[PDB]
């Protein structure tokens, strides 16, 4: 029952790592083994806010956010917008599932309350802008993993692996 955090992969520049440093442990569910990204989470009814990347919830099961989910702690700076869940590892939604993980995790999620200032006309967008794909590759994959761009030349396939899966929704507001 270690900690985890949902470091989503949007097309927005508001990603430093958006929460906090690498694990401190040694377990990673979002592996790179087979041919690229694996074990993504595609939880429904959210958006990236296009800035200050929490997740605004919605009552629509057709709004999606994707991205890598990694371990660690919630920034020790903001514990009023993060969920602090505990999932039994059976009741969460995965993609490109791998060798089963049958132990629970206390995952952390960046969540800004709905705050109905406007009406949510959430609109979809998939990962594009080859300029910005290496942006979020460097600030995350080179940082949170240090496995890309320096020791895995297969990135020229894993580059498109990013373009395949990750397609989130946003409010464009």
């Amino acid at each position: 029952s270690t900690q985890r955090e949902y470091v989503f992969i949007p097309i927005t520049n508001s990603i430093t790592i958006d929460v906090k440093i690498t694990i401190g442990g040694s377990d990673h569910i979002t592996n790179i083994d087979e041919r690229g990204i694996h074990n993504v989470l595609v939880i429904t009814g959210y958006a990236v806010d296009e800035k200050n990347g929490r997740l605004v919830p919605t009552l629509d099961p057709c709004d999606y956010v994707k991205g890598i989910l990694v371990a660690g702690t919630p920034q020790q700076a903001q514990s009023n917008d993060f969920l602090t869940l505990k999932l039994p590892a059976n009741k969460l939604y995965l993609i490109r599932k791998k060798g089963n993980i049958s132990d629970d995790l206390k995952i952390y999620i960046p969540y800004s309350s709905p705050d109905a200032r406007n009406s949510m006309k959430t609109k979809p967008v998939s990962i594009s802008d080859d300029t910005i794909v290496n942006n979020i590759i460097k600030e995350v994959f080179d940082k949170i993993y240090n496995i890309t761009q320096k020791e895995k030349v297969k990135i020229e396939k894993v580059k498109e692996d990013i373009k395949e899966l990750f397609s989130y929704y946003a409010l464009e507001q």
Binding site: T44, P61, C62, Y64, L94, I95, R96, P124, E164, L165
Partner: protein
């Protein structure tokens, strides 16, 4: 054997089927089936022939004898076909439907110990497993065929296409009893394939139609004359009908890009009459050509008209049905959004759409019109007078305000047509549409009404200016 002629045509949004009822399948792709051309060419021959027979003899002849008459051209159980088609569609590829991966195993877990029904919907380039038990979970698939955006629009915006998806999109799944995943992962996996393949729709399918002759068919009675009449029925097939599915609603509409020929002694007038469509330039100018082609098959240039032969057989009006061309119900408008009118035709054929709720402004004269013209309509005779008050419009003889009388449709009892016009789930639509153009970018919608044999008699000009206002608000 030698090449008779070649017809470079195009099809507009054809819905050609296959073994899976789609134009693409895990093994190959055919947007044009040369078997449907031969089958429709024969259907547009038994229609044109009975048109030539209801304008010079006042007679109608059954299908099983018209083809028996023409079996020396199209072939039958007793003789191979004299013409053989060969479609060479462009781009000549293999292009099967391959589903690379479909990451769906939560909806599997959403389906244990329950009898739900999965339903697929394509919402914004992403598809969702609409479990009617309130779970619109998404799916991350990856396949071929590149559904652009337009078909997703065109399908969802066309009430006819979206209505026929109701089969290819959903299926119940019983799981209260013994269940599995290797079994459910393969039920759901094909449900995707049989759904995405419905979206292999393309406008502008350009193909050639080579037609060969054998030069071994001695002129039995009218071979040189039967044949060149069949070419006529082929042009009117191209000019009035389309290939594929729902051609009675504009889909699969055929055009002409360029016509060649290789035997002047036969194709002479055919290629010429076909040459007159490469440069259409005005709506009512084509309305003249539509009639120009038709009359040259009638009293003008009477192609040997040997009806005095002991092969034919007059029909029985109370037990047979025959479709022929009424040369008067024809309307050529102009359009510039094919997709719009392709989706507009639903306004004109539905018993609630906003084109015949205006023209025929009631319940009964509206429905009874469709029942007799819009093909087969699902009419549920379990409610009140609205089976008889529509019957009162379709009786053989009774109090009629509108002329929709059927040859033996009696009240207080059911004859053969009484059930046929009411309960026979496969009845073509006499009211038809077709979009046609080439080389001019000037698309012309065409509307017409095939003349049937079960009609006692039809007021021409009335149902014409019904059709007139129809083709007007369809744009």
């Amino acid at each position: 054997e030698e090449l008779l002629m070649s017809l470079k045509l195009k099809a507009l949004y054809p819905l050609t089927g296959g073994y899976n009822r789609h134009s693409i399948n895990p093994f190959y792709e055919e947007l044009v089936r040369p078997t449907e051309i031969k089958g429709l060419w024969r259907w547009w021959n038994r229609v044109l022939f009975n048109t030539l027979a209801y304008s010079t003899k006042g007679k109608l002849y059954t299908y099983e004898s018209i083809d028996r008459l023409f079996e020396d051209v199209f072939g039958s159980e007793n003789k191979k076909s004299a013409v053989r088609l060969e479609v060479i569609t462009d781009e000549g590829n293999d292009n099967r439907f391959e589903l690379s991966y479909v990451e769906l195993d939560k909806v599997i877990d959403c389906l244990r110990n329950y009898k739900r029904k999965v339903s697929l919907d394509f919402i914004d380039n992403t598809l969702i497993a609409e479990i009617e038990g309130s779970t619109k979970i998404p799916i991350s698939f990856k396949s071929n065929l590149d559904i652009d955006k337009i078909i997703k629009d065109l399908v969802h915006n066309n009430k006819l296409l979206s209505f026929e998806l109701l089969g290819f999109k959903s299926v119940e799944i019983d799981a209260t009893k013994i269940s599995d995943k290797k079994i459910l992962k393969e039920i759901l996996r094909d449900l995707i394939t049989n759904y995405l393949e419905y979206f292999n729709i393309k406008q502008e399918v350009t193909f050639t139609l080579n037609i060969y002759l054998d030069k071994s068919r001695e002129h039995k009675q009218n071979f040189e004359d039967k044949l060149k009449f069949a070419l006529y029925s082929l042009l009117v097939f191209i000019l009035l009908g389309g290939i594929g599915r729902k051609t009675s609603r504009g889909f699969g509409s055929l055009s002409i890009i360029d016509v060649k020929c290789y035997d002047n002694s036969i194709c002479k007038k055919i290629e010429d009459l076909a040459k007159n469509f490469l440069k259409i330039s005005s709506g009512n100018e084509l309305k003249s050509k539509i009639e120009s082609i038709l009359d040259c098959i009638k009293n003008s240039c009477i192609d040997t008209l040997y009806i005095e032969n002991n092969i034919l057989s007059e029909i029985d009006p109370k037990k047979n049905v025959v479709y022929f061309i009424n040369s008067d119900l024809f309307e050529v408008k102009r359009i510039n959004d094919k997709e719009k009118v392709l989706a507009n035709i639903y306004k004109a054929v539905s018993s609630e759409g906003c084109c015949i709720k205006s023209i025929i402004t009631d319940k009964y004269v509206r429905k009874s019109f469709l029942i007799a013209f819009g093909g087969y309509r699902k009419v549920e005779k379990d409610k009140g007078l609205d089976i008889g008050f529509i019957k009162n419009y379709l009786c053989e003889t009774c109090e009629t305000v509108s002329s929709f009388n059927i040859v033996d449709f009696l009240l207080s009892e059911g004859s053969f047509m009484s059930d046929y016009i009411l309960q026979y789930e496969h009845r073509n639509s006499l009211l038809r549409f077709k979009l046609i153009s080439d080389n001019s970018n000037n698309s012309y919608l065409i509307g017409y009404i095939l003349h049937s044999s079960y009609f006692k008699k039809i007021d021409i000009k009335y149902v014409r200016c019904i059709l007139e206002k129809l083709t007007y608000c369809v744009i």
